[PDB]
Design a protein around this motif. Sequence first.
Motif, mmCIF file in Angstrom:
data_model
loop_
_atom_site.group_PDB
_atom_site.id
_atom_site.type_symbol
_atom_site.label_atom_id
_atom_site.label_comp_id
_atom_site.label_asym_id
_atom_site.label_seq_id
_atom_site.Cartn_x
_atom_site.Cartn_y
_atom_site.Cartn_z
ATOM 1 N N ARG A 151 -0.532 3.710 -2.862
ATOM 2 C CA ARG A 151 -1.915 4.145 -2.615
ATOM 3 C C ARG A 151 -2.024 5.160 -1.462
ATOM 4 N NH1 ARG A 151 -6.299 -0.331 -4.585
ATOM 5 N NH2 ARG A 151 -4.926 -1.766 -5.708
ATOM 6 N N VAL A 152 -1.115 5.068 -0.493
ATOM 7 C CA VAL A 152 -1.012 6.058 0.579
ATOM 8 C C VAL A 152 -0.721 7.446 0.001
ATOM 9 C CG1 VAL A 152 0.634 6.947 2.357
ATOM 10 C CG2 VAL A 152 -0.381 4.617 2.593
ATOM 11 N N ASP B 25 -0.784 1.141 8.170
ATOM 12 C CA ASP B 25 -1.084 1.477 6.786
ATOM 13 C C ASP B 25 -0.646 0.366 5.841
ATOM 14 O OD1 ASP B 25 1.618 1.794 6.508
ATOM 15 O OD2 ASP B 25 1.569 3.950 6.131
ATOM 16 N N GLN C 190 0.833 -1.184 0.000
ATOM 17 C CA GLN C 190 0.000 0.000 0.000
ATOM 18 C C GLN C 190 0.872 1.240 0.000
ATOM 19 O OE1 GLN C 190 -3.096 -0.098 3.066
ATOM 20 N NE2 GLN C 190 -4.652 0.371 1.498
ATOM 21 N N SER D 255 -5.995 5.665 4.163
ATOM 22 C CA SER D 255 -5.134 4.508 3.906
ATOM 23 C C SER D 255 -4.817 3.639 5.132
ATOM 24 C CB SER D 255 -3.816 5.021 3.334
ATOM 25 O OG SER D 255 -4.045 5.890 2.233
#
Lengths: 230, 230, 230, 230, 230, 230
Positions: free
Chosen positions: D116-117, E111, D113, F121
């Motif tokens: 996407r963060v 996250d 991720q 997120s």
Amino acid sequence: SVHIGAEKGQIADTVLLPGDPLRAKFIAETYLENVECYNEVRGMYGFTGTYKGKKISVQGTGMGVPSISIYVNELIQSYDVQNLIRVGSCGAIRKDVKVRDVILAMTSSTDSQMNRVAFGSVDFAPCADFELLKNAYDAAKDKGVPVTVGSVFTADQFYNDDSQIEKLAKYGVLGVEMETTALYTLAAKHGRKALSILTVSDHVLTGEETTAEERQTTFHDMIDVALHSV
Amino acid sequence: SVHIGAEKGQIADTVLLPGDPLRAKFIAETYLENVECYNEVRGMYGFTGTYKGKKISVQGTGMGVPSISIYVNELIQSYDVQNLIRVGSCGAIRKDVKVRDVILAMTSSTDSQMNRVAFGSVDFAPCADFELLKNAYDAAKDKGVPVTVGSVFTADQFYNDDSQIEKLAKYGVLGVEMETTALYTLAAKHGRKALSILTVSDHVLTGEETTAEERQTTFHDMIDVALHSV
Amino acid sequence: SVHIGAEKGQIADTVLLPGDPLRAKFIAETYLENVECYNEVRGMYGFTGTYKGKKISVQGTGMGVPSISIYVNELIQSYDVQNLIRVGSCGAIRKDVKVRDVILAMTSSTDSQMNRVAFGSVDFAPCADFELLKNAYDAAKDKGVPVTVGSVFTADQFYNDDSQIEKLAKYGVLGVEMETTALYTLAAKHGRKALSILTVSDHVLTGEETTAEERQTTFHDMIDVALHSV
Amino acid sequence: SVHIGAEKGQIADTVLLPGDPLRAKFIAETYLENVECYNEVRGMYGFTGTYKGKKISVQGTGMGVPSISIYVNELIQSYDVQNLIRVGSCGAIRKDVKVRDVILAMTSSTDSQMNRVAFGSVDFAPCADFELLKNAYDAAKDKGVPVTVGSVFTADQFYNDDSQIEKLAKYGVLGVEMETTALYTLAAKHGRKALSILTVSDHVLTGEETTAEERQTTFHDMIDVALHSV
Amino acid sequence: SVHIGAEKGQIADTVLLPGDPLRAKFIAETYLENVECYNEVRGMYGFTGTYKGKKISVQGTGMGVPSISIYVNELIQSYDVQNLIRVGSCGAIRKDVKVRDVILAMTSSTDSQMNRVAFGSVDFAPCADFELLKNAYDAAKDKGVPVTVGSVFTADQFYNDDSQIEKLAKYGVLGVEMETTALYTLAAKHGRKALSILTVSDHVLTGEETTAEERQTTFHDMIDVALHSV
Amino acid sequence: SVHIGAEKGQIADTVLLPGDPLRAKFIAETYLENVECYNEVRGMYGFTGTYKGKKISVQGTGMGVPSISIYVNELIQSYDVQNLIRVGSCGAIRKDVKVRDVILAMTSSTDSQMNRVAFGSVDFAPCADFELLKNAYDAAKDKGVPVTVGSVFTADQFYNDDSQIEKLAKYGVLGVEMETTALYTLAAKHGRKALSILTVSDHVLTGEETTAEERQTTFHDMIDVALHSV
Ligand SMILES: Nc1nc(=O)c2ncn([C@H]3C[C@H](O)[C@@H](CO)O3)c2[nH]1
Ligand SMILES: Nc1nc(=O)c2ncn([C@H]3C[C@H](O)[C@@H](CO)O3)c2[nH]1
Ligand SMILES: Nc1nc(=O)c2ncn([C@H]3C[C@H](O)[C@@H](CO)O3)c2[nH]1
Ligand SMILES: Nc1nc(=O)c2ncn([C@H]3C[C@H](O)[C@@H](CO)O3)c2[nH]1
Ligand SMILES: Nc1nc(=O)c2ncn([C@H]3C[C@H](O)[C@@H](CO)O3)c2[nH]1
Ligand SMILES: Nc1nc(=O)c2ncn([C@H]3C[C@H](O)[C@@H](CO)O3)c2[nH]1
Ligand SMILES: [Cl-]
Ligand SMILES: [Cl-]
Ligand SMILES: [Cl-]
Ligand SMILES: [Cl-]
Ligand SMILES: [Cl-]
Ligand SMILES: [Cl-]
């Protein structure tokens, strides 16, 4: 049915769904002849009576999507409920929406994750039943009631960062409440007819504000529009 | 305007938006008096003419959300377009939707990420303009045209894994096309009035199928309903 | 094939894919001997001819991922197309990208939800076919054409809040268009070879700007690079 | 620099990044003249030496995106590192990828991720630097090394439900490792040149399998290709 | 087991998991009688010994979720490990968290996309094993060690835009590290008992700062609390 | 305060939060001396009284995250409430969770989008206050009450596809309810102390089932544990 203490068919084909179980009481007493009380579980009162000779039920939903979902499901699945009409208020978020205006939701935006769980990659746009909606519009215009027809926003949080409604007003969303998406979706899933009818409780990004008198008028006003919708 | 080679106001307040720039041609020639041709860029033909003495424009959009978005934006922003009506077809996904039926979209589900980019945590439910929609329903019922009113599904992919429409049929979505979400949202954002009017191209999860004759009928049929909608 | 009105193998192994169906016309007439026209559906013209004795096809895609996806799929699935090369322009988003530069996309970022639908939790990074790409680089350097090799951004919205490209420039993305992700992914899925070759249309976060002359040069320039890529 | 115990410029412009800090040792001793050891923090050994008279550094990264990110950032930010080449292995996921094949990643898919963060609505497709990559391809073909050029998959979990790679193989992704996305992105952000060069460790959806001999060959083989890449 | 070069049961029921494989060395030598060394793969050293006559193992994890996941899985699956305790540090993010404080994580925010891959629509809140945690609290209070009990934040990126921890401090999250979510989840999945015990490395949004002396104290301090936790 | 019709400080520092506003009544009458009734809005009854001489309040929350959020916020913000303890039931989802067991939630998983709206997120793992929780564990063990300590699952939908709890049981989540995430998060945000104490209502993936007698016991049992928690 787990949440509703009622005998089969002791509940009407048609149910009005206020958020408040005490306005549920009020509506029955003040509008319906031969008042039955089927449900007293959780104080979430349910009532059945007649109006113009026809059977009409009145069930409180509580607040938020997860709560109304509970009642809508049981009402549908355990009592073959055919027509489900929400009658609550909403916070007006445009300026061209007047305190007198009665609101008919064609659809609603939501931040609830109820739909994304089931659909994933789809923004699912829920849908009022047209027949119900048209009937309400007709029942509005004949008596000459102020009435707007557009979308609302079914929120998960009464108090928010609220960045959303400021952006959503910019797209013509009319007002914010906490139930409609949940109604429309569950009604559509199970082949039933749903519609959400709403008054203004106050202006959230204040354009104007409300008195106790204006509410009493529009409230009553909305119940009529609902009732004559059949 | 980058994509539309047209002089200011050489475009009407009202624009019909077929996907096909050749049906755009067809519609002009076969329905409108005094045919002008403002746009020839990308073969995406644009036309202006009169019908019952009133000025009506006709612009092809191409296919998919990103394409129609392009035209809708310029039409709105660079030509102060007031009323935008889509006239295309859609793949029927329920069985209770008949090949003859003319479809008026109140709303649409989409898998396009167009809205999630702008809104984030919100399933944004787009909205047909009621005035336009009611007018179309009225213009339908007076001539007695078969007409259904509910939601559709604006897809990004003609060929899909398509797991979606099978699930979406279960919620009463009527049909799948590739434009509506994009229209409704951009129209709502800029204060304009949009509506999407659609015929059945075929049944996707086949309940029944289509001939060339049935389309020719419903097509023409839909253009009327649009045209008389004002 | 639903969207392309063509007889089996009346389409080449190799297809150039401009966005514009009129540049599709142009390219055929101005570059190919023995010009056939297989497709006239939706004005999205398709052509087949020879160049240096070899068969080459030219199909317009329209704009946005959903549209090109349509043609790429049918071209692949219904016409066993082997090599698919995009030839369009893109908005330059870095400053070190010159108007003369010809761009070879190794990959592209996208905000289209096309991939997230299919993959879910995966950022799927699409991929140009190396053989095609190397061949294009070779065909560029021998004639001595200015050529940059990096990534682009396949957007869903021509007009955006556009916060993205400002962030994407900071990561060395070269330019923005609306097709490539869709090509690379569908080509890779079906075992075919794809590559996207692009000129600069203008600078989006203006570093410099374009004349009609500079485009005419780079356009022609790009078609050569494509053509000699085999 | 927090994680790397080194004096300014005691680290080369060029750094080879194996996952294993003990292969980091191995590579130095077995390939480089005048072996310095700048880092001993966390056993994540760092080395500097010469090869064909030129200064080359060798730093172990550990495993997974979050770990390599740590070293790549400090190497870049605190030591103005110019060229960063990963030299590790990957699990082959296609059948047409041979145990001998040396892999040059143009790009990688990831389920991390990390992107996407930073980007939100964007599938960000990271990018090898072409100059580095071409140089490696050239350095491969002249000596005649088997070499494939395509994408990989940077995973967060060595042991997965792994539904992904089965789907990702269907799109022509070559192999799975745990570093590349992180390299390419951080390298691109800071204006540096990155490339990931990889051998096959075994076939994950077994097409064939590996001996100790085959690895020793391809390993050495890969280090050469890297080293001659400048 | 792929990553750990060890004979069956040459590893204890109980394993302390420092990030650093050199603190792993340190802890063994300085705290345990009869020091065995089972693992030397990747320099990620593993050790087994006794303390108060009882068998205790010590394995370094490396950094980030993907890395510790690797060891935790093999330790559990290939060595039927029963109790897994993390002993590392974390960056303090509140002001009411003191450099002396020893931290017991009930849970952690992350996250990392590790959970969203497996669960989808669920924010999965991982969980320390109470028995282990209570035992650690008891072992803390009897010796009178400063000890706080709340949540942490398992991050994917040491260097971030870091907007998160500023928001996460506002919700009472204590500190940031890079392992815990991964431990708690994998431990819970496989029926094992996990707990994460952490010292302050420094204050990230500086309230106060650290000396070498304060760490040496709290470090040792934390190892005790762990060791007496059984 | 909009939803709670109460005078400042007519509400205690400590509030027990049952879902049911009628169990709210019950608890007051059956457990507290000097019963006041501050709230009657929406039938969501609120009460204040003493127990062992100490002031204790009792407020019903309704069902689902959006509803309890409403009360928790006002209770905190408008009445400086210090300690908030949920006392409801949950559907047991493991087999090793017994009908007698009293549950103390350290944390909860949720599918509510309440957190993802605010954090993006981040999987945000909410947290019971330890002091409250330890006190409840102590108050449990001294009287010798069966008590389990782990996580739960705060769901948005009583009736679900429910694929989740089957997966969540596999990770040691104890039970499903509809409030806790919302409590823990809002309590943590505003610097207050929250804890959720829960009985088993029935087994959802039936391991065993419940009588009216078993509930009456565990209910009463849970109220004690709460009450003595201070
Ligand atoms: N969020 C929100 N803002 C308002 O201004 C508003 N006005 C009415 N409602 C509806 C919806 C709930 O059922 C319930 C929450 O008070 O009433 C509102 N909800
Ligand atoms: N996906 C999809 N399925 C159908 O059966 C269908 N029928 C019509 N359309 C509309 C929408 C496009 O503009 C265009 C794609 O052919 O036509 C459809 N789209
Ligand atoms: N978004 C975007 N910005 C540009 O500056 C640009 N320049 C060229 N293109 C490509 C891609 C489309 O096919 C089509 C849209 O005009 O042309 C662009 N797209
Ligand atoms: N997931 C995964 N599957 C494989 O078959 C494989 N082969 C090599 N690698 C790389 C990447 C890590 O740095 C590290 C994990 O062992 O080595 C792999 N990773
Ligand atoms: N992100 C982050 N910020 C800190 O201030 C901090 N202090 C300790 N740690 C832990 C976690 C890693 O294993 C490793 C990274 O140095 O050490 C931290 N991680
Ligand atoms: N989803 C769900 N499943 C159960 O078996 C269950 N048992 C108790 N609860 C709690 C939570 C609600 O406040 C309310 C819904 O009845 O009661 C449950 N919720
Ligand atoms: Cl209401
Ligand atoms: Cl169409
Ligand atoms: Cl183009
Ligand atoms: Cl490696
Ligand atoms: Cl650590
Ligand atoms: Cl409850």
